[PDB]
C-alpha cells in the first residue's frame, strides 16, 4: 500500500546535481526540471539506501558526502516517515 518503498534513479546534471534538498534524512525540496523532479523523488520521505548502500542511521553529512562523491547515476530508496 502507501508504505511500499520507492526506488528513484536519477542522473546528475552538467553541474553535478540531481536536484534536491534534505534535512535529518528527509527530503525537503525538489529542484524544478531536475532529475529528481522528473523521476519522482518525493518530499516527506526518508532516505534509506543510496546506490545499494544502507544509509539508515548515518548523519546528514555522511549522506551528503555519499551523494556528492557518487558517479552520475544516483539511486535512492525512499519511504514515508512520521
Ligand atoms: Cl495503505
Strand ordering within the main sheet: 1-6-4-5
CATH fold name: Pdz3 Domain
Helix content: 10-25%
Bound small molecules, by name, code or SMILES, are: chloride ion
Beginning-to-end CA distance, first to last residue: 16 Å
Order of helices and strands: EEEHEEHE
**Roughly what fraction of the amino acids lie in strands?**
35-45%
Oligomer: monomer
Shape: globular
Please tell me how large the radius of gyration is: 12 Å
Find the structural class using helix and strand composition.
alpha+beta
Report the top-level CATH class.
Mainly Beta
Largest sheet: 4 strands, antiparallel
Tally of individual helices: 2
What do you see in this structure?
Helices cover 18% and strands 38% of the residues. Strands 1-6-4-5 form a 4-stranded antiparallel sheet. It has a two-stranded antiparallel ribbon with strand order 2-3. The relative contact order is 0.29. The protein has one domain (1-82): Pdz3 Domain (Roll). The protein starts with 5 loop residues before the first strand and ends with a strand. A hairpin with a 2-residue loop joins β4 and β5. The protein has helices at 35-39, 60-69; strands at 6-11, 20-23, 26-30, 45-50, 53-54, 73-80. The protein is globular and about 35 Å long. It contains 2 helices and 6 strands, in the order βββαββαβ. It is an alpha+beta fold and 82 residues long. The structure holds chloride ion. It is classed as membrane protein. The entry lists the keywords PDZ, membrane protein. It forms a monomeric assembly. The entry is titled "Ultrahigh resolution Crystal Structure of syntenin PDZ2". The protein: Syntenin 1. Organism: Homo sapiens.
